[PDB]
Amino acid sequence: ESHPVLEKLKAAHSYNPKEFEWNLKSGRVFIIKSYSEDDIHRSIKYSIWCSTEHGNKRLDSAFRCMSSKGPVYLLFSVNGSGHFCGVAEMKSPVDYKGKFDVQWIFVKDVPNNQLRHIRLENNDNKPVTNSRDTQEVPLEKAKQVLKIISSYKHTTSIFDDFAHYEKRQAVVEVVRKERQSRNK
Ligand SMILES: *[Se]c1ccccc1C(=O)Nc1ccccc1
């Protein structure tokens, strides 16, 4: 059994494309650390993301700075998960408590031990897997990461739990509407 929302998404977008240009002529790449998989699910189906106030200021600056001379890529990982779950392109400046359009491109789990050997000189040579939200990846290291994520033969992705997230969100909504109703 597959969910019809996921089927509409799969038919309308080309997730995990076989021909992806990882050796960029230009562009900038950033690590997004999400608090939960729920946020990732919502982001994939609505093509939207928000960081913190400072995160949105930095991503705003990067997007407007690039002036469509190249892409701005976001590599997503949930705090404490041990893998990246996909990559999306930032597609609009931040709109104002600050949201912005994103286009998901890769939706696949890449374990951290596939990427931990890549270290970030602008972050005390710490592994790319030990980054904070909106940490920028140097371009050549970005190409190493994009190549690895693009070519990895993933065995799973958040899509495998799609219906589960669908149900969670729905229950949460009712739980809120009832609780709020009980207050007034
Ligand atoms: Se973020 C945000 C800010 C203002 C209005 C709406 C949103 C939104 O839809 N956010 C969201 C989508 C997916 C995952 C996390 C947050």
Author numbering: 363 to 458, 471 to 558
What are the paper's exact sentences on this?
YTHDF proteins bind the N6-methyladenosine (m6A)-modified mRNAs, influencing their processing, stability, and translation. YTHDF proteins contain a hydrophobic pocket that accommodates the m6A embedded in the RRACH consensus sequence on mRNAs. The YTH domains of YTHDF1, DF2, and DF3 share a common fold with a central β-sheet surrounded by five α-helices. Three conserved tryptophan residues largely define the hydrophobic pocket involved in m6A binding.
To further study the ebselen binding and mode, the YTH domain of the YTHDF1 protein was co-crystallized with ebselen, and X-ray diffraction data were collected at the Se absorption edge to locate the Se atom unambiguously. The Se atom appeared to be involved in a covalent bond with Cys412. The ebselen molecule sits on a very shallow groove with one side resting on the locally hydrophobic protein matrix, while the other face remains solvent-exposed. However, in the two protein chains in the asymmetric unit, ebselen preferentially adopts two slightly different poses. In the first case, the selenobenzene moiety almost inserts between the aliphatic segments of the Lys471 and Lys473 side chains while also contacting the intervening Gly472; the N-phenyl amide group stacks to Tyr408 concurrently interacting with the Arg404 and Ile410 side chains. In the other pose, while the selenobenzene group maintains similar interactions with a minor ring rotation (32°), the N-phenylformamide moiety inserts more deeply into the groove in van der Waals contact to Asp401, Arg404, Ser405, Ile410, and Trp411. Electron density is missing for a relevant part of the extended β4−β5 loop (residues 460–469), which is then flexible and disordered. Although binding at a site different from the m6A pocket, the ebselen molecule impedes the conformational rearrangement of the β4−β5 loop into the m6A-binding-competent conformation. The selenobenzene ring in both ebselen poses clashes with YTHDF1 residues Ser461–Ala462 in the m6A-bound structure, while the N-phenylformamide group either collides with Trp465 or Val464. Finally, ebselen displacement of both Trp465 and Trp470 generates a unique pocket extending to the m6A-binding region that can be exploited by ebselen derivatives with improved potency.
